Amino acid sequence: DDVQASPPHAVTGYRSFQLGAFELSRDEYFARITWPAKGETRSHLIPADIFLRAMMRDVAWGFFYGWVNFDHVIGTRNYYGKVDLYAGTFNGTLKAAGVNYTENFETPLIMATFKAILRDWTNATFDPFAAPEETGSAFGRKNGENLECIERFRIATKRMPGLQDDSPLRNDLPVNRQFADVSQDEPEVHAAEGFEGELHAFSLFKYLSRSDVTWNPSVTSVCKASLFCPTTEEFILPVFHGNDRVEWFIQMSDEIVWDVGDKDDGNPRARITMRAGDVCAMPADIRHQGYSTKRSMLMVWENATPNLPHLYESGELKPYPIEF
């Protein structure tokens, strides 16, 4: 939990960071990651915007499941309590050149470091969670902070938003410019006498219409291990995902396009287009990335059953959910 960071660069303004072997520094346009392989120091450059957007999802999701790739070179892999940070290890050509490198870390330390890297590289002009059209540039020299955007406080949802001891509804937030025509009507709830506040319903669409973040599933209903985690998508999913378990999507408004390839070298497997009302299962043996022109309403359905990885490794569960 003790973050090796440097002093602010003389010209640039930004701190550089150390994480095991990995060196992470940035300048006016690029983040730059450094690792050792074959006796020399290898480098890689990613546009600041791409980089921050991805790191933000990495932090927000707690490193998620499976493989989270910032791009064809850099990515992380959550082994729950421990996280791998890797460079090219899952890029065919680098693995084969012997130039790649991985290193494990305890979750609490890599988190402290990533959270730190964001606090320092996100200027007051940029919001890593937003679509491009919604926000300024990530480029240039260091210029203030944006704590408000990279440090969102949320109340965990226990059962459903809108209940008393639960997460709040969003009536106090603006409707997003791209959801400006979604009805803001709430369901009518007529409780019988002696039962006031014993029944609950809200407007999911009104809810998502007011989402200030992008590509961030958030929980709206819990059924034991079954979680509904709707999100609102705009532009390009900030990372490409190598799956670990089967995932399910229900497209609720508009459309998203999904690129789908082998988890390794990226042999195209499919290209999926989901229009309103479509239900799709993403296999556990592929990687995927989403494109969405208009801010759209997508429902991500998660299974929080803990022994899930055991099941997939045993063959108790096949790569794809259904034999028909």
Partner 1 sequence: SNVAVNTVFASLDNFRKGTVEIISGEARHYAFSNIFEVAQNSKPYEKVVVGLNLGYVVETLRAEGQSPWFTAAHDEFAIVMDGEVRVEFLKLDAPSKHGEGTHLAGELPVGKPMGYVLLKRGHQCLLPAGSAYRFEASRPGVILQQTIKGPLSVEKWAEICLK
Q: Which of 142, 210, 263, 287 binds partner 1 (CB under 8 A)?
A: 142
Place of tokens 């989901």: 274
Question: Which residue is nearest to Fe ion, using beta carbons?
Answer: 241
Rounded-to-integer distance, Cα 239 and Cα 288, Å: 9
Place of tokens 């899930």: 308
Q: Does 44 bind Fe ion (CB under 5 A)?
A: no
Q: If binding means CB under 8 A, how many residues of this protein chain bind partner 1?
A: 88
Contact criterion met (CB below 8 Å) for 89 and 95: yes
Q: Is 288 annotated as a binding residue?
A: yes
Q: Is 190 annotated as a binding residue?
A: no
From Fe ion, a second copy, partner 1, none, interface partner of 241 (C-beta below 5 to 8 A by class): Fe ion
Rounded-to-integer distance, Cα 245 and Cα 263, Å: 12
Q: Is 72 annotated as a binding residue?
A: no
From partner 1, Fe ion, a second copy, none, interface partner of 61 (C-beta below 5 to 8 A by class): none
List the interface residues with Fe ion, window 233-262 (CB under 5 A).
Answer: 241, 243, 247
Rounded-to-integer distance, Cα 219 and Cα 229, Å: 4
Backbone breaks in the chain (C–N > 2.5 Å) follow which residues? none
List the interface residues with partner 1, window 218-277 (CB under 8 A).
Answer: 220-226, 228, 246, 248, 250-255, 267-277
Least distance (Å) from partner 1 to the CB of residue 102? 18
Least distance (Å) from Fe ion to the CB of residue 61? 11
Contact criterion met (CB below 8 Å) for 102 and 84: yes
Rounded-to-integer distance, Cα 143 and Cα 81, Å: 34
Contact criterion met (CB below 8 Å) for 85 and 102: yes
b vs e for 215-230, b when ≥16 Cβ sit within 10 Å of the residue's Cβ?
bbbbbbebeeeebbbb
Contact criterion met (CB below 8 Å) for 138 and 132: no
List the interface residues with partner 1, window 31-90 (CB under 8 A).
Answer: 38, 40, 42-43
Shorter beta-carbon distance to partner 1: residue 51 or 207: 207
List the interface residues with a second copy, window 237-266 (CB under 8 A).
Answer: 257, 265-266
Residues that bind a second copy (CB under 8 A): 27-30, 42-43, 45, 47, 93-94, 96-97, 99, 132-133, 137, 139-140, 235-236, 257, 265-268, 271, 291, 293-294
